[PDB]
Structures are given as structure tokens and as C-alpha cells.
Design a protein around this ligand. Structure first.
Ligand SMILES: Nc1nc2c(c(=O)[nH]1)N[C@H]1C(S)=C(S)[C@@H](COP(=O)(O)OP(=O)(O)OC[C@H]3O[C@@H](n4cnc5c(=O)[nH]c(N)nc54)[C@H](O)[C@@H]3O)O[C@H]1N2
Ligand SMILES: Nc1nc2c(c(=O)[nH]1)N[C@H]1C(S)=C(S)[C@@H](COP(=O)(O)OP(=O)(O)OC[C@H]3O[C@@H](n4cnc5c(=O)[nH]c(N)nc54)[C@H](O)[C@@H]3O)O[C@H]1N2
Ligand code: SF4
Ligand code: SF4
Ligand code: SF4
Ligand code: SF4
Ligand SMILES: [S]
Ligand SMILES: [W+6]
Lengths: 967, 214
């Protein structure tokens, strides 16, 4: 008998770090009544099969950790001390701050007389670390209070993916899932360090290799990922579009594309109108004065009924495919090799290996994560990967897909719940000031007159109405529509995003900030500015596991507490293994997890913190009145709680949705109170509520499908690893998106040995079919307006085809592909004192700002201090020896780090000059551990893309100098 | 008995095994600092039974040969650490007759610890400065006898770590060696007839660690 686990209760959980979604087993002493005694991998979980990387493997040390917060702390204005206070005091005073700030700032109408009903004096950051039910409740609490400045992590690493993949396929999500990587014949890892940043993914990546796959890593650095790939191809920072453009040209020149798939399922046959053109690096319709495109110059030619014309023969000169060929003919090997720094030999090797997957019996996948997709044209980077995958027939198939790796455990879910300024839950847009009615809101949805085009978004009025019924069930949806805030139609969308929030804070334009489950004092670019800007807040609420650089910014480096008037409330939340709820992993698996030990000390789950906070705000409004109380007073929070506690189960059932009356829908009768079985049965007339239509199907009358732990599989399911009875994924358990593209028009798989779906005896067998309908009767991309995978993507701000524009401003002066050097729809100083390209990235052992992992002694043990990785060539130039202390400096700040001199970094040759890169982990911060160092974001600029609102963390100019000590 | 097969050609140096070993036994962390390497702790110690060693080797063309070596007691079939300890006190080092695990006991404080360490061809034993007890990997013998995999085997994401009966593990090591040789012509098994932790090295084992093999 193992004494350690004797007398302890075993429960299951899901790792609280990255988006792989590994399963845990937690043992809790005293048969559940004591503390955790052991945490390790769940041997039965189909993704990790008991494996854990060091972050998952140390969760015991995260939870049973005497450095955790134990109770609320209060920091009075100009004080230098925390005072421990009760939850009642902290939440009552916060509710008072919220109400006073809202009452003083609330705007019913904007300066144009349009209804907006919002407060602009509070902002909120966070968080992908909360459970899905907590994320959904949190956004609705914020919007009921009138907030529009609602952001979190997803803005940086997730937001570029969504329009890029939605333009191409109709949805922004990762198209396949982790287990499916083992079905791939060629895995291209580009803009991802997956062996360190999604480690259990290499279980499946190496299993593909075991079956004969070629693994290719394309990265400026040699990493732990590169060590285990067949091909490591170095690429110069920011040269990804040339690399991918060369691959497009290669595919097209060599007729390696899958003609039948391309002809039927992409928009290759659509006829582009005569107004489209491309010249000198500019698409037609360019407005030079405003550096913006009139996208109507890119329109398709339409037939009598408004459907884009098609030439299925693919011979018309204005067919997408023929315009595609013309566009990429400039991306020849020698130019691509010159700019990428990849040898022509390696380019040919990579191109041949990957384009071989255009055969229907071979599948290729692309894995990318954050990489350098945040600059001006990162969306076009992703667009090019999507176009390559469509040309090769790799979308919809097992071992194919665009596997855009999500970062954090629940960043998929927190985005699904609308914790970004521009979206409500379920990717319904936040209304702007000119959507004055629900009918105007609904009128913006594009329609299609192609009877083969499903155009599923035409159902949006059902989802909007059902969401409004979930918040305000006793109101008509058109009435409830007026309760929620609207953004200004005149303003640029990025005015409401991450980077402008820090900007407005530095200008004193926010009275209050919620730092909910985030550490902006380390995670925001240009940390010196942000740390100072936090001092301009009246009040700051930090909800977090530990005291940290954000909660305690007022006593950070160079800070005088006596000069800083900000009132701070630190509210300690409980860790993942101390609460129940769900998290949605990168493959959209919505996985239920259970409480092991009870919350440590006096910590609380986020859901209880926010609900008690909101209830106190409600009480103040019922006693005092104030600005527009109705959205607060009428919010349906009864459905969120049970046993006087926040209820994950009840919130999850409301997010799924249920019938508010007896209703007839889709040819069946439903009783009041029944769970909605799928989003197909939602309605627009108020018969249904649903907090998030994507969740309709996750928690039905059959029970909690997210909590299924059933490994049952048919032979065809098990052959590719669908595990359809393990948990639940949106939408309606379709595990591989776009799987109708995986079959021909009789319903037979292109690749029978790896079938995803198959038409058998009048039904689709295998995965859940992505879009109902007989074989050959529907276009396969049902969320697209026109139904096709988009090679030509005319909704993108930079043009309908990706085009190289230099993202490296300082060391490059020439664009070999056009006279247009930088992005034409997009002020680096390039001070010559800072001649090296700094970059930040991750290591396996630490998590994000390191707030969590710098508190875990076993992880500090392996990676104790900030380090700086440099080439042997740069170390020689600067006289730096390995292990020396160096000072890294920028126009923004300076820090010291330990030099790591390694051939894993090599100089870039740019225009005949060696250009040196300097690598830093952003995992460190002044609070802990001793001598760990501070955040690499002291160096980064707060300048970001005009069009994405993301700061530059992958290429910023620095100097590196040896720090000397005594002889 | 039991045996590990450790296929270093699959290792991503994630260090899950390093952390899992300490979680299962609730071992303390050492004081470390970065001296120009991701490797840490720099060495095995009384509180560190496994550490992943990092070695970079130049190669023609881009990249490097990055060699990762999760070091642990080899659980020798005929352990000389036991032979040396038995000179001072039998029972300080014992061998589990079912698993083959070589086990240090509290009686190691009563033997010449330095000579026990010097007897080991792999330089594995480590001494506590306070108590003079010896420590090392114990094969997670507790877990094994109760039907669980060793913590570092269970946690491994890549299939580097393998554990089982010696005959299946030896057959696996031989078949994996033949396959791995097609990419790494210099691949070899470390002392496979003498130890219970059989590493597959992709080249000269001493490039992974000076004591990688006897
Ligand atoms: N261990 C660990 N894992 C994590 C995290 C963590 O903190 N620690 N964070 C999680 C989160 S929130 C996120 S968003 C993801 C991020 O996942 P990743 O994108 O994998 O994270 P990075 O290490 O920052 O960048 C990955 C690779 O991009 C390369 N790169 C830099 N510039 C370029 C370029 O121009 N082109 C190309 N092709 N490559 C380039 C870098 O050298 C690096 O190897 O990881 C998640 N996983
Ligand atoms: N230079 C540079 N900067 C970057 C990046 C980069 O690559 N380079 N990456 C960017 C990206 S992609 C991201 S994801 C951000 C990350 O930015 P942050 O989110 O601010 O980083 P952390 O605070 O370290 O994320 C871990 C947080 O999760 C919290 N947490 C864990 N569990 C819970 C819970 O149950 N409830 C609550 N309320 N909180 C919980 C911990 O307290 C901790 O604050 O950093 C961004 N900034
Ligand atoms: S951090 Fe990611 S790969 Fe590591 S154990 Fe957690 S979910 Fe799995
Ligand atoms: S857990 Fe496995 S892959 Fe990770 S370092 Fe240990 S042996 Fe290598
Ligand atoms: S077998 Fe057990 S004691 Fe030995 S290294 Fe692995 S986890 Fe540590
Ligand atoms: S490796 Fe050394 S310590 Fe381990 S059993 Fe062999 S002789 Fe003893
Ligand atoms: S994230
Ligand atoms: W992220």
C-alpha cells in the first residue's frame, strides 16, 4: 500500500497552464477534507495518457504553497503597507468604488446623440486563466456595469488568428486537435516552439514521425523543438511571408495542388471583378491620403441573383486561381533565399517535403502559435498558411489542418466568452453606436442566394436574442438590447484594445482598473511606462494567486509609495485544483474538472469573488439609485448560484441554454425548462435562452457532456483518435472542422485509410459532420457567406492575397518583391546606440510573466534567473563570455541578465551586413525570487500596429554590454 | 527484475522527469543560479536524484547537435556500491529481489560514504553533509511494487522513458536501436548487459556525460 495516497480521495482535474489540456489526478488528504497530498498525470486521459511537462508536474507545489495569498489586502493611498482586511470590507469598498466611478462617468448618449449607455472610466484586463463559467459571468458583470474597455491575453497571441482563419475557412479556431497530429505525414512547425510551449503535443508529433512523417522546424533560433525535428531551417525574423509565398509559387508551378479539392471546395473558380489589380506593391483602390483601401475594388463579379460567378474549368483569366498564380510568380527561390537567409537547397527540401502532401493519400499540417504574428501583417502570414493548406487539400482531413496553437489553458474559452472589447459571447459583435436597434444589429449579417451555401451565420438573430434572454429573461430581446453598452462607430476599433488601454491610463483617463488574473506590470510592453501609469489610477483591483508586481507596483523599482495615490485591493483567488468548472483547450475540447482540496486559507474561486462583488453593487443601487440602474438591477444572477455559492453547473447549463416556454422548433416539441439540445434549436422570438450559442449542445437533458470520460470509439474513430465520447467540443462535437472537404461529392474519403467522415447507408459516419446535407449538395465551409475556402480573401485590410511588406523597420531598406517597403495600410526611432534585434520568448519550465512559476521552487531550481541568449559572433564582438553578467538596454529601459553564448543563435545576413539578435525570456519580475531579475518588458516599446493594437515583443532594438566586476 | 529503456533520440529536455521525481518524494529544491546554461541543478546531490544534463556540439550547416541526458542510478545487476558498502556494514545497501532495485538505507550513514561513491562506475551516490546518509534514485520501487510506473517514466511526454520487465525492455531496446541507427549511425546502448537503466545514445555516450557509461 502506498502510504502517501492511503486515506486520500482521488479526483480528476485539467492542467491550469497551457492549452494542450492534460489531465491530472489529485489526491486530497482526509478523504477530501484536507490539503492536496499529490498531483500527477491522469493515466486514462486520451491526450496526455498520464504524461506531464514540468509545469503540470509541479502543480502540487503551486497549490500547497505557503507564499499564496491567504486573505484580502488593502493598500491605502500614499501608504507603504498592506493591511489585511475581511472579504466583507474589501468587496463592500470595491462595490462603492465601482458605483461612485460609474455614477460620475456614465454616458447614456455620446456626443452625436446616439445611445451608448456606457462608462469609459473603468477598464478590465483578464483572464484566460479563469474557468469558462467564470469568464462568461465576468464579461456579463462588466457589461452590465457599462464597461467597453474589456480585454485580456487573447488580444496578443489569439486575435490575429481569428480574422485570418475566419476569412479563409469561416471560423477562427484551430481546425484539428492534438491527437490528430499523429495522423500527419508532414508537420511544419513555424512560429511555434511546441516542444517547450506545448510539450505534450510532441507525444503526438513524434508518433507521426514513428509512422514515417517528416518533421520540419522553421525558426530563427535552434530550440528544444529543433533538436527533435528531421529538418531545421533557420529563417530571418519577419521573413515568413516570403517563405510561404515561395511555397505557394512552388506548389503552383509544379502542379502539386489537389485539383479536384481546389476546384470544388476553395474559391479558385470564382471570377474576380475587373476592378481588382496589383501594381508596385499596391492593390487597386488605394487611398494614399488615408493609407487605406477601398475594398469594393476587390469584389467578385456577381451573377443575376448576386452569387459570385464561377468558372469551374478554372480557365477564365480572372478566376481566383489564375490571379493567384500571377500574384506569386515573383516569389522565386533565389529572392526568397536572399531575404529569408534560408539556403536554396533547404528551401527546395522543405517545399518538396511539404508540398508532397497535396496527394490525397498524404496529409500535411502547419503548427504555429504566437511566433512573430503580431506585427502589421501577421494576419497575412496566417492567411498564407491557410492558402497553402487549401491548395494541398489539407483542410478538413485527418493529420491536416491549420493547428493554430492556443496559448493558455482557457484562452479559447475566454475568447468564446467575449472578454475582448469587440465581441459578445459566441463571437457576436459588440454593437456600435449606429446599431440603434436590434433590427439594425441583425441587418448587418451578409446573406447568400447560392442554394448550396449554408451560410450558417444567417442564424445569428437566434443567438443574439437567446443571449439577451439569458441575461434578461423577463425582457423582450429588443428591450434588453438597450441595456448593454455600445462602442462609437466613428472611432477606430483598436481605441478599445489592450495597447490603447495602457495609453489612456498613462494619460490619466481611467479612474479604476481590474487586473483580474493578469500581471500587466510585467506582461505589458514598455513596463516602465505602465508601472508609472498605474499610479494615475484612483483604484486598482487585483485578483490573483500571489502578491505580485501588479498588486504591489507602488513599491516596485524606483517607486516612492508616499507619492503614489492609488488605492489597491488584492483579492486572493483559489488555484485550479480547488474549484470545479470547465476549460476549453486548443482543440475546443471543453473539459470538466473537479475540486480536490477546499480553497486554501481564505481564498475564493473567481466566480464567488465576482458574484459577491456584483451583488454588493446591486445592493448599493437598490438603496441609493444612481445612473441607469436597470442593466444592473435586472441581470439574471439567480441562475448563477446554488447553496449560497457560485455554481459552475448552473452557469454551464445557462450557457448551453434552456427553453423559457413550451416551444416547437425543428419539427419537435420541447417543454419549458428543458435544456436546448443544440444551437440548431435556438430561436429568435424569446422562447430560448442561451448564454453562448457555441455551448448549445454541451450540457443537455442527457447531462454534462463536458464531463464525459468515455474512451469508447468505433474502428474509424479510433484509427484517427477522435475520442468523440471524451468530453465535448464545440461546435456540436465536430472534432475536425470543415470535414466535409475530406470527402468527394459521393461522400467517399479522399484518404480512406484516414477517413474523418464517410457517407454510409444514408448517413455520415465517423466524426460529426460539419454541416448537414447529402453528399454533393452543400459547399463545405458552412460559416463562409459563399461556402468556399478562400484563397482570395477580399475582407482583409492589407489586400486579398498576402504580400511581403518588411516588418523589420530598422535594419532593412529594400523589398525585393515590390517598391513598397513597409505595410501601406499601417515610427521606430532606430537609434544607432541600440544596434541589435532584441526578442522575447518562452522556456519549458516557466509560465508567462512567471508570477506562478517563480513561486514554485522546483521550476526556479531549473531556471533561476533571467538570461540573455547571444551568438558566438556577438559575444566575440562585445567581449562577452558565457555566464557573464550583461546589461541589455533600449530606449525604453535597461536590465541585467546572465549571458548564454550559444551556436543556437546565428547572425542574420541582411543586405550584406551581419545583424545580431539578442534573446530574452519574459518570465521574470522584481518581486520573486531573489536575484531572479526583472521583466524583459522593461525593454520593449509600447508602440504597436495601427491596425491590431498589439505591442512589439518579438523584434525591438537593444544594446548588450558586459558588466564588469573586480579583477 | 525490472528495467528502464531510455531512448535519448526522443528527448525534448522538457525536464518533466526532473520535477516529477521531486514531487513524488517531496524533495527540496536546491539553491541554483544560471552560469551560462539551461542545465540546473548542475549535478546530482543528496536532494537531487535526477537532473537533465545539456550538451551542445557543433555540426556542419545550421543548428547544433543538442544532447540531453536525464541522469539516474543505473540499478546495476551486480552493484559495486553494494560491494563496497558491505565491507563496512551489510544492510546499508540492499537489492530488491523482485524488481532488481538497488536501495540505500539509513545505515549508509554508518559506512564510508565517499568510498561507496568512488566504487560506483557511474559516479552516482551523493552524501548528505549533515547526516552522512547516501541518496540516489530508488527506481520508485514503492510505486513499482504497487503497480504504478516510476514517476519519471509516467510523466515523460515523448516516449523517451520506458519501463517494464527486463526481457521485454531488452527486446525493445534492441529493436529501437536497429531503427534509430538508420538516422544516427553511431547509436549505441549503454552497458546493456550490466545495468537496469539502459540508455540509447545517438553517438559517443561520453558526449552526453563523462560518466554516461562505465
Ligand atoms: N513553457 C511555456 N509554454 C507556454 C507559455 C509559457 O509562458 N511557457 N505561454 C503560452 C502562451 S500564453 C502562448 S501565447 C504560447 C506562445 O507559443 P510560442 O509562439 O511557441 O512562444 P514563443 O516562444 O514566444 O515563440 C515561438 C517561436 O517563435 C520564434 N520566432 C520569433 N520570431 C519569428 C519569426 O519572425 N518567424 C518565425 N517563423 N518564428 C519566429 C521564436 O524564436 C520561438 O522559438 O505558448 C503557451 N505555452
Ligand atoms: N515581452 C513579451 N510580452 C508578452 C508576451 C511575450 O511573448 N513577450 N506574451 C503576451 C501573451 S501571449 C500573454 S498570454 C500575456 C500573459 O500576461 P499575464 O496573463 O498578465 O501573465 P501572468 O499574470 O503571469 O499569467 C498567469 C496568471 O494567471 C493567474 N491565475 C491562475 N489561476 C487563476 C485563477 O483561477 N483565477 C485568477 N483570477 N487568476 C488565476 C495567476 O495569478 C497569474 O497572474 O503576456 C503577454 N506579454
Ligand atoms: S503545461 Fe501544457 S503540456 Fe504541460 S502538463 Fe500542462 S497542459 Fe500539459
Ligand atoms: S520527461 Fe522525457 S522528454 Fe522530458 S526531459 Fe525527461 S526523459 Fe526527456
Ligand atoms: S525512478 Fe523514481 S527515484 Fe528514480 S529518477 Fe525516476 S522518479 Fe526519481
Ligand atoms: S549506478 Fe552506482 S549507485 Fe547505482 S546501483 Fe550501480 S554502482 Fe550502485
Ligand atoms: S494566451
Ligand atoms: W498567450
Amino acid at each position: 500500500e502506498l502510504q502517501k495516497l492511503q486515506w486520500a480521495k482521488q479526483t480528476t482535474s485539467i492542467c491550469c497552464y497551457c492549452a494542450v489540456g492534460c489531465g491530472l489526478i489529485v489526491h486530497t488528504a482526509k478523504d477530501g477534507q484536507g490539503r492536496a497530498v499529490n498531483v500527477e498525470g491522469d493515466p486514462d486521459h486520451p491526450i496526455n495518457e498520464g504524461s506531464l511537462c514540468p509545469k503540470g508536474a509541479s502543480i502540487f507545489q503551486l497549490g500547497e504553497n505557503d507564499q499564496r495569498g491567504t486573505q484580502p489586502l488593502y493598500r491605502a493611498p500614499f501608504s507603504d503597507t498592506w493591511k489585511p482586511v475581511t472579504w466583507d470590507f474589501a468587496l463592500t469598498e470595491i462595490a462603492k468604488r465601482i458605483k461612485k466611478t460609474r455614477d460620475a462617468s456614465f454616458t447614456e448618449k455620446n456626443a452625436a446623440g446616439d445611445l451608448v449607455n456606457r462608462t469609459e472610466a473603468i477598464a478590465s484586463f483578464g483572464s484566460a486563466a479563469m474557468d469558462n463559467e467564470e469568464c462568461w459571468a465576468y464579461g456579463n458583470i462588466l457589461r452590465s456595469l457599462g464597461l467597453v474597455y474589456i480585454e485580456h491575453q487573447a488580444r496578443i497571441x489569439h486575435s490575429p488568428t481569428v480574422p485570418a482563419l475566419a476569412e479563409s475557412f469561416g471560423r477562427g479556431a484551430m481546425t484539428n486537435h492534438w491527437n490528430d497530429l499523429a495522423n500527419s505525414d508532414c508537420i511544419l512547425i513555424m512560429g511555434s516552439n511546441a516542444a517547450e510551449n506545448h510539450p505534450i503535443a510532441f507525444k503526438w508529433v513524434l508518433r507521426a514521425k514513428d509512422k514515417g512523417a517528416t518533421l520540419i522546424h522553421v525558426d530563427p533560433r535552434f530550440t528544444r523543438t529543433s533538436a527533435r525535428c528531421d529538418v531545421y531551417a533557420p529563417i530571418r525574423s519577419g521573413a515568413d511571408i516570403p517563405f510561404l509565398g515561395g511555397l505557394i509559387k512552388y506548389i503552383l508551378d509544379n502542379k502539386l495542388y489537389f485539383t479536384d479539392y481546389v476546384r470544388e471546395y476553395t474559391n479558385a473558380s470564382l471570377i474576380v471583378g475587373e476592378k481588382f489589380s496589383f501594381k508596385d506593391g499596391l492593390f487597386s483602390g488605394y487611398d494614399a491620403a488615408n493609407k487605406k483601401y477601398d475594398k469594393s475594388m476587390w469584389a467578385f463579379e456577381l451573377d443575376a441573383n448576386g452569387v459570385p460567378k464561377r468558372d469551374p474549368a478554372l480557365k477564365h483569366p480572372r478566376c481566383v486561381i489564375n490571379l493567384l498564380k500571377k500574384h506569386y510568380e515573383r516569389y522565386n527561390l533565389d529572392k526568397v533565399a536572399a531575404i529569408t537567409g534560408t539556403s536554396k537547397e533547404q528551401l527546395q527540401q522543405v517545399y518538396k517535403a511539404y508540398a508532397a502532401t497535396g496527394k490525397p493519400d498524404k496529409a500535411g499540417t502547419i503548427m504555429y502559435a504566437m511566433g512573430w504574428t503580431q506585427h502589421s501583417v501577421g494576419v497575412q502570414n496566417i492567411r498564407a498558411m491557410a492558402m497553402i493548406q487549401l491548395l494541398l487539400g489539407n483542410i478538413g482531413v485527418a493529420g491536416g489542418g491549420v493547428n493554430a496553437l492556443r496559448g493558455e489553458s482557457n484562452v479559447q474559452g475566454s475568447t468564446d466568452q467575449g472578454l475582448l472589447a469587440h465581441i459578445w459571447p459566441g463571437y457576436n459583435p459588440v454593437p456600435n453606436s449606429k446599431a440603434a436597434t436590434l433590427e439594425l444589429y441583425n441587418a448587418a449579417t451578409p446573406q447568400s442566394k447560392d442554394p448550396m451555401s449554408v451560410n450558417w451565420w444567417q442564424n445569428r438573430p437566434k443567438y443574439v436574442a437567446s443571449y439577451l434572454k439569458a441575461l434578461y429573461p423577463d425582457e423582450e430581446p429588443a428591450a434588453a438590447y438597450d441595456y448593454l453598452p455600445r462602442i462609437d462607430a466613428g472611432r477606430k476599433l483598436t481605441d478599445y484594445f489592450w495597447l490603447n488601454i495602457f495609453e489612456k491610463m498613462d494619460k490619466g483617463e481611467f479612474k479604476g482598473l481590474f487586473a483580474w488574473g493578469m500581471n500587466p506590470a510585467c506582461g505589458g510592453a514598455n513596463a516602465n511606462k505602465n508601472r508609472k501609469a498605474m499610479g494615475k489610477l484612483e483604484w486598482l483591483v487585483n485578483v490573483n494567486l500571489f502578491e505580485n508586481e501588479t498588486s504591489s507596483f507602488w513599491k516596485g523599482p524606483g517607486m516612492n509609495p508616499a507619492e503614489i495615490g492609488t488605492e489597491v485591493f488584492f483579492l486572493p483567488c483559489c488555484v485550479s485544483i480547488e474549484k470545479e468548472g470547465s476549460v476549453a483547450n486548443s482543440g475546443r475540447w471543453m473539459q470538466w474538472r473537479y475540486r480536490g482540496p477546499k480553497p486554501y486559507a481564505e481564498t475564493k474561486p473567481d466566480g464567488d469573488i465576482m458574484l459577491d462583488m456584483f451583488k454588493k453593487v446591486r445592493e448599493l443601487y437598490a438603496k441609493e439609485g444612481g445612473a441607469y440602474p436597470a442593466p444592473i438591477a435586472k441581470l439574471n444572477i439567480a441562475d448563477w448560484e446554488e447553496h449560497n455559492e457560485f455554481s459552475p453547473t448552473k452557469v454551464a447549463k445557462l450557457m448551453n441554454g434552456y427553453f423559457l416556454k413550451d416551444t416547437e422548433v425543428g419539427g419537435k416539441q420541447f417543454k419549458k425548462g428543458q435544456q436546448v439540445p443544440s444551437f440548431a434549436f435556438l430561436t429568435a422570438d424569446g422562447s430560448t435562452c442561451s448564454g453562448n450559442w457555441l455551448h448549445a449542445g454541451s450540457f443537455t437533458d442527457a447531462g454534462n457532456l463536458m464531463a464525459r470520460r468515455d474512451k469508447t470509439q468505433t474502428p474509424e474513430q479510433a484509427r484517427i483518435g477522435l475520442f468523440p465520447n471524451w468530453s465535448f467540443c464545440w461546435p456540436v462535437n465536430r472534432r475536425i472542422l470543415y470535414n466535409r472537404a475530406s470527402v468527394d461529392k459521393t461522400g467517399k474519403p479522399w484518404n480512406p485509410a484516414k477517413a474523418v467522415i464517410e457517407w454510409k447507408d444514408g448517413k455520415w459516419v465517423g466524426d460529426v459532420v460539419d454541416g448537414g446535407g447529402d453528399p454533393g449538395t452543400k459547399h463545405p465551409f458552412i460559416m463562409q457567406t459563399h461556402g468556399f475556402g478562400a484563397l482570395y480573401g477580399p475582407g482583409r485590410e492589407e489586400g486579398p492575397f498576402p504580400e511581403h511588406y518588411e516588418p523589420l523597420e530598422c535594419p532593412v531598406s529594400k523589398n525585393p518583391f515590390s517598391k513598397q517597403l513597409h505595410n501601406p495600410v499601417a515610427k521606430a526611432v532606430c537609434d544607432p546606440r541600440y544596434p541589435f534585434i532584441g526578442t522575447t520568448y518562452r522556456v519549458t519550465e516557466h509560465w508567462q510573466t512567471g508570477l506562478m512559476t517563480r513561486r514554485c521552487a522546483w521550476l526556479v531550481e531549473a531556471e533561476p534567473q533571467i538570461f540573455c541568449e547571444i551568438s558566438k559572433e556577438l559575444a566575440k564582438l562585445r567581449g562577452i563570455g558565457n555566464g557573464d553578467t550583461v546589461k541589455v538596454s533600449s530606449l525604453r529601459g535597461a536590465l541585467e541578465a546572465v549571458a548564454i553564448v550559444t551556436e543556437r543563435i546565428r547572425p542574420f545576413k541582411i543586405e550584406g551586413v551581419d545583424v545580431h539578435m539578442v534573446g530574452l525570456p519574459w518570465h521574470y519580475g522584481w518581486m520573486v525570487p531573489k536575484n531572479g531579475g526583472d521583466t524583459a518588458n522593461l525593454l520593449t516599446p509600447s508602440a504597436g500596429d495601427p491596425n491590431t493594437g498589439i505591442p512589439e515583443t518579438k523584434a525591438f532594438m537593444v544594446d548588450v554590454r558586459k558588466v564588469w566586476s573586480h579583477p | 527484475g525490472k528495467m528502464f529503456f531510455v531512448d535519448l533520440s526522443r528527448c525534448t529536455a522538457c525536464r518533466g522527469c526532473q520535477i516529477a521525481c521531486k514531487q513524488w518524494k517531496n524533495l527540496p529544491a536546491e539553491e541554483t543560479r544560471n552560469t551560462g546554461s539551461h542545465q540546473n541543478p548542475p549535478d546530482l546531490s543528496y536532494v537531487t536524484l535526477k537532473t537533465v544534463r545539456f550538451t551542445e556540439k557543433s555540426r556542419k550547416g545550421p543548428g547544433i547537435d543538442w544532447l540531453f541526458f536525464p541522469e539516474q542510478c543505473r540499478h546495476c545487476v551486480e552493484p559495486p556500491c553494494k560491494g563496497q558498502a558491505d565491507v563496512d556494514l551489510e544492510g546499508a545497501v540492499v537489492k530488491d529481489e523482485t524488481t532488481g532495485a538497488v536501495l540505500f538505507t539509513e545505515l549508509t550513514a554508518k559506512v564510508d560514504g565517499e568510498s561507496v561513491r568512488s566504487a560506483c562506475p557511474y559516479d552516482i551516490p551523493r552524501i548528505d553533509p549533515v547526516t552522512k546518509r547516501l541518496s540516489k534514485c530508488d527506481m520508485c520501487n514503492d510505486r513499482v511494487q504497487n503497480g504504478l510506473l516510476p514517476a519519471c517514466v509516467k510523466t515523460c511526454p515523448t516516449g523517451t522513458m520506458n519501463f517494464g520487465d527486463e526481457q521485454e525492455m531488452l527486446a525493445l531496446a534492441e529493436k529501437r536501436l536497429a531503427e534509430v541507427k538508420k538516422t544516427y549511425p553511431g547509436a549505441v546502448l549503454g552497458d546493456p548487459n550490466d545495468v537496469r537503466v539502459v540508455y540509447l545514445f545517438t553517438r559517443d555516450p561520453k558526449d552526453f556525460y563523462e560518466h554516461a557509461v562505465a
